[PDB]
Amino acid sequence: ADYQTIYTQIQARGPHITVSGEWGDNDRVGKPFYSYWLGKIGDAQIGPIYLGASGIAAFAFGSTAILIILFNMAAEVHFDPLQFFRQFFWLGLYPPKAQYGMGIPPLHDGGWWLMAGLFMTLSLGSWWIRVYSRARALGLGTHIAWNFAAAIFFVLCIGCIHPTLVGSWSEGVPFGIWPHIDWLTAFSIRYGNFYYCPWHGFSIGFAYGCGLLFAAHGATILAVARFGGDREIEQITDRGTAVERAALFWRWTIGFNATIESVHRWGWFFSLMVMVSASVGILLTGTFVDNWYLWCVKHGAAPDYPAYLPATPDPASLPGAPK
Amino acid sequence: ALLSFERKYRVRGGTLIGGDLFDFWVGPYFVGFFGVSAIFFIFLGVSLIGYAASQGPTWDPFAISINPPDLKYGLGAAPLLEGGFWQAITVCALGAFISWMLREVEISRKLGIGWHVPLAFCVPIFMFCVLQVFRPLLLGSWGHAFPYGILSHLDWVNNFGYQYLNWHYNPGHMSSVSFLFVNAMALGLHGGLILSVANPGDGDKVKTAEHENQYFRDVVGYSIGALSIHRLGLFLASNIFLTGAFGTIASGPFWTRGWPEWWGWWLDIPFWS
Amino acid sequence: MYHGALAQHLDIAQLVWYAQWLVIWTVVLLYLRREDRREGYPLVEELPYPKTFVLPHGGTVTVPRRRPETRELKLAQTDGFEGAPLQPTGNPLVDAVGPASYAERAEVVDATVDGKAKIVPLRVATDFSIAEGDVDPRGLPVVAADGVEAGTVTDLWVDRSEHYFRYLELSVAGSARTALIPLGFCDVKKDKIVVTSILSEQFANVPRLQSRDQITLREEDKVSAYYAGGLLYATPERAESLL
Amino acid sequence: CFEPPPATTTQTGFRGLSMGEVLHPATVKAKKERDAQYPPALAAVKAEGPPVSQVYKNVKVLGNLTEAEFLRTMTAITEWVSPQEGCTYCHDENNLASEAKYPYVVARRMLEMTRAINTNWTQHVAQTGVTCYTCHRGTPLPPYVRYLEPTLPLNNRETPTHVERVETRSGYVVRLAKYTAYSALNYDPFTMFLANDKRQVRVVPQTALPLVGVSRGKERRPLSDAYATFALMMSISDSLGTNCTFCHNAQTFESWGKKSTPQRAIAWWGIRMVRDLNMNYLAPLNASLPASRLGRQGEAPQADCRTCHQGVTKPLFGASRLKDYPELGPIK
């Protein structure tokens, strides 16, 4: 058994790493702290952390939005400190309930939401630059920055793009623990059971696959951890016995395999496609499809089942039946 | 037929049962005893699905469905057309999954590596049992289990979730979803990082393990490490079905109301009410 | 009139549905599946373009690996049909076959952020420590699978880049020793280091290295491979049926 | 935090749809023993005599009964509405023709309403029907009523906490949540849907593609409507003590035929019935009830689902007195 794959039995300490970046070496902040219990399942050193203009813009815009949201939450309980801590999950900031179209809604009905939405967007955009710039500041590929973009893009879809495309701010996602959860069903109901949106199935297929892949890959690297498999950069440019057996375990199992490099393209793609498929689903939704179930019925894809309890005629269509 | 570095490894041994008898390869596939039993269960299972699909007004994949019995049959045997086909296929599916798992144990054994992959594979097998056996057994009938059809089994999940009003409030479900999300996130980060170091652009120098840790020290103020991301990863991915199983088995056997109401334990406490 | 409606019974979302499948299979088959075949190919007994990595401190390496000279097998086939298993003609631990096999990758000690040797002893490692709370293997006995003292701790070897110990190395009783053991193969107790991968008589062959202060990559693989070969070959009792 | 096994499960859809009820025996058992307090019908009486339109001076609804039959009704009503204070709750001690107290004039209206339900709304109550008890359960104030805003507790026989009181605005979200099965849906389905016939419960389109003229900008209903519909559904479900699959195949909530249960259609006739009761019988009563009965906007107590069901698919589990008191309806 590998006791190293469970926890690191013997832990190592030494002088701080510091690799210079093209800029901002001085804007690193924090004296690095060592946690013994953290270092049983990760590296013990916590910090330092890089500030830099994009990073601080993120916290500025971000906090601004959160403040808006928390303040609007506090008012929902008359600013009672007890009830706020109590009802917190039920509290939220809601998009306009009346139909103002794309017109900027009143502060008490959607206004504060739109503004909190705006500052949140600025916050995400600020952090993106951080993710991007830090990559090429350290002479690294922007693979992370572009994955993070797909997630940012999708949030924009459910946040403002799809609202703009259908022409209503009322279709936005509220801020809150339960309230933003409530939106999920209101949106699915409105558009005819989202189980019948193909890009929904696609997005799910990719998300599940993200589970499968890093369950398999995560376990794969643990299995060849005795051969220093976790050292992957120097297993790509230079193949050793770790991914020899890793490539062969899967080749003997499913009939084909990847490389130590290419398996990372598989996981990056799957993750990307969770967002890519989702965004396409939301865009199509409302715009060009108004009921995904009926859309499937039209194309003869929807399943049909025999009656258990008798067929029930729509009473609204009965002769003499009320409005 | 073989990889450039492969024949080095194709030695005998590492069998659990069978010895030399099934210790051989078919193309790139290893067989072993559990290769033989897998094919048996898979042939039988697919045949049953085929013969069952023979019978309905079937044939286009999206409309093909093989359903469990009525609730009234309890845990008893059902008429093959009225649920029995499902019962058998269920069994075959379990034979196939477990075989596939132990086959992986045999392959790990011959390669001299840890058994982490087939041990990981026990988690989805486990969840399948929760859905198709466990929760039915507690509820008393097999008819509570999901049907085998590409679209039909979605409608099973759909109705089941609504049977508890808003399935979103299911705390077991909240944990499960949380793990599915963060796992997809971590996979994107990790794969993206490794590529960033090996594929950094233009006429480049491939960067180092110090650049790895470097990057996440700057962005979030911590890097978990090269080896630790892989145990973290197996941890997040596994806890999808490890935590989610609680919310599934709790629905029915241990809770019959809507899941939003379940949070009455927090909301209805006398000194907040 | 309807949004998204086209000619016949056709609509926009219907078209995108096909485009989605086309893109996905294009990426999977005409990219990801080809990216998978960068090493191990071509087969013996569809491929992609070359690629050239520029390595951190001098030199390049490019997909495939067109290699020095190739090792000579020390195994005999068990039967003549294509998929038959093979069988060790000597001691499978010494000719590095099966789970005892290693990779033929450059005998270079590969390095740190700044040039130094990455995997080095604490007698070298300057400034590296054992974290307060974890046990010090310094001077402990190494107990093999047969229960016999195979020897005693000498030093522990650290990755200078990741701050992570990867090898114990130790003395054998009775051969003027010393050689490597990956700590994936060790169970660190308070008074002993338990190793069940090999018997104590078999520590005698643990691949030595031209250096006492170094360790190169082929080495790292040569050392790790042999202990892993013990999981199947240490006794006649491991090539078994478990049942 | 949890309810011990086993659990009572029913099947309402095709096998393998996971459609049906999920009930906890202890809850169900408790509800029967509560609904079993339905007083037994009074023994039958003399069929002959002059109609009380001859006999009594101020009888305008039940004027065709004989005196023995008419008094029987008065005993039953007394049982059902005001058993503790008896007749004098609704009668001047020695002038029984007098409408000098308010429960008299309301009780007349209440007689007509009850007959209305059993006669005109047989698409809902069928031959089960209702009596005074179905809502009152032995008290002048029905336990489950609803004002023009969320109130707590749902049962007015229970003492409200401070935060539950309608005046305490810090607790508005909870009042809203508990009427909607503890969801955070920010909508009151009673006033939106059940108090009147103004708004439409249906919000899901009946075409695949968006219909031009109703799918862009201010042509569209706000998404808020689907929320509120969800809120009505949460409320109805808790009121009957079931879930969605009791009525829907959640494959497509918007569809009837095999995609719905006969109960959903019955339920449809209930909403229509409840609106009728509120708009034409109960709401106009604020002019006859004392100020102490009225809500904060001068509203009289009005009925929803729960008013009769009180947590059950059928009120009092199908118990009826319909043939025991034909004067209560249906009416020829």
Ligand code: BCL
């Ligand atoms: C409680 C949760 C639900 C559930 C909820 C959902 C939802 C919701 C969705 C799916 C989707 C899918 N589900 Mg399901 N699913 C459950 C359990 C299962 C089981 C099982 C053994 O228990 C199977 C085989 C499947 C199979 C599948 C696929 C048809 C599809 C894509 C999944 C995917 O990419 O995964 C990750 C795996 C990979 C990326 C690798 C490739 C796997 C391929 C796709 C497997 C195809 C198997 C196919 C059914 C044939 C079976 C065998 C025949 C004998 C040939 N589900 C349970 C019952 N599943 C989506 C869909 O599109 O459905 C139509 C979807 O929207």
Ligand code: BCL
């Ligand atoms: C009744 C309710 C509906 C439902 C409603 C919806 C709706 C509506 C949608 C989905 C969507 C998704 N659903 Mg669905 N869903 C249901 C049933 C399921 C089932 C199932 C087995 O039953 C599964 C597996 C899923 C799973 C999925 C996902 C695969 C998919 C993408 C969303 C996602 O991952 O977001 C997780 C990822 C993110 C949110 C990205 C976040 C990225 C950003 C950068 C994070 C920012 C953090 C930062 C700190 C925030 C600071 C804030 C401060 C204020 C500043 N759903 C049913 C049918 N679901 C989407 C989709 O694909 O639609 C086509 C979608 O829009």
Ligand code: BCL
């Ligand atoms: C209205 C309906 C409800 C809903 C109803 C349910 C129900 C009901 C359940 C879930 C469950 C799950 N839900 Mg859901 N869920 C909803 C909304 C969501 C949302 C969202 C964005 O709102 C998300 C992210 C999710 C996500 C999730 C998953 C994380 C979770 C576990 C899935 C599972 O069991 O897979 C199961 C997958 C397997 C068992 C795969 C097994 C594979 C086996 C081992 C091998 C197969 C081999 C194959 C056949 C081989 C083919 C050969 C080919 C060659 C490849 N749900 C809505 C609100 N959801 C479950 C849970 O845990 O709940 C707490 C659950 O029980």
Ligand SMILES: C/C=C1/c2cc3[nH]c4c(c3C)C(=O)[C@H](C(=O)OC)c4c3nc(cc4[nH]c(cc(n2)[C@@H]1C)c(C(C)=O)c4C)[C@@H](C)[C@@H]3CCC(=O)OC/C=C(\C)CCC[C@H](C)CCC[C@H](C)CCCC(C)C
């Ligand atoms: C939490 C951890 C998770 C995780 C992890 C891992 N996953 C693994 C491993 C690990 C670690 C492996 O090592 C192993 C493997 O080698 O990978 C390449 C495996 C694999 N994961 C597969 C599918 C998969 N994983 C899912 C879920 C998770 N995986 C989650 C995320 C899902 C979902 C979500 O639906 C799917 C579809 C196969 C591709 C493969 C097994 C092949 C098999 O077992 O062959 C043996 C069986 C057959 C070839 C067919 C048997 C057919 C029966 C008899 C007849 C049909 C019956 C069937 C019930 C009908 C269903 C109808 C349908 C519409 C309802």
Ligand SMILES: CC(C)=CCC/C(C)=C/CC/C(C)=C/CC/C(C)=C/CC/C(C)=C/CC/C(C)=C/CC/C(C)=C/CC1=C(C)C(=O)c2ccccc2C1=O
């Ligand atoms: C002909 C016959 C009957 C022979 C009998 C012998 C026998 C047992 C045959 C088996 C027959 C059967 C059932 C074959 C089916 C095999 C299956 C299930 C194939 C499905 C393939 C699928 C869809 C896999 C999903 C996961 C996925 C997208 C993988 C793509 C990327 C890959 C290959 C990941 C695997 C992989 C991972 C995860 C690494 O970490 C790693 C690290 C270092 C080097 C290589 C690798 C590597 O290859």
Ligand code: HEC
């Ligand atoms: C909850 C209301 C209520 C209760 C309880 C009640 N009454 Fe009645 N009573 C009425 C109403 C209203 C009328 C007139 C109904 C009508 O016009 O058809 C009426 C009519 C009568 C009349 C007709 C007198 C006349 O000249 O019009 C008599 C007598 C009478 N009730 C006696 C009784 C008796 C006896 C009891 C109990 C044992 C009783 N009441 C309890 C409300 C009530």
Ligand code: HEC
């Ligand atoms: C006992 C009855 C009943 C229950 C319980 C019930 N439904 Fe409803 N539902 C109906 C009826 C009747 C309508 C249509 C009302 C109308 O036509 O005015 C409807 C309408 C709907 C609609 C909108 C249909 C459309 O055309 O827009 C949705 C969505 C819905 N229900 C979902 C649910 C949800 C969600 C639940 C529970 C959480 C639920 N059903 C439980 C009877 C019920």
Ligand code: HEC
């Ligand atoms: C004033 C009386 C009253 C009100 C208000 C009321 N119900 Fe009913 N309902 C009844 C009675 C009495 C029955 C018994 C019918 C039967 O036994 O078939 C019934 C039957 C039903 C059934 C049939 C259950 C079954 O198992 O067959 C459903 C569903 C239902 N009601 C839903 C509702 C809905 C929806 C509402 C309001 C929106 C409502 N109830 C409010 C009196 C009422």
Ligand SMILES: CC(C)=CCC/C(C)=C/C=C\C(C)=C\C=C\C(C)=C\C=C/C=C(C)/C=C/C=C(\C)CC/C=C(\C)CCCC(C)C
């Ligand atoms: C104290 C610490 C460590 C953290 C604090 C976090 C905290 C307690 C926050 C408080 C309450 C909580 C938990 C809030 C959570 C809210 C959630 C879950 C929100 C989820 C999704 C919200 C979404 C997707 C909103 C999207 C909205 C948008 C993208 C709007 C876009 C707006 C624009 C583009 C503006 C352009 C239009 C212009 C003309 C005005």
Ligand SMILES: [Fe+2]
């Ligand atoms: Fe990796």
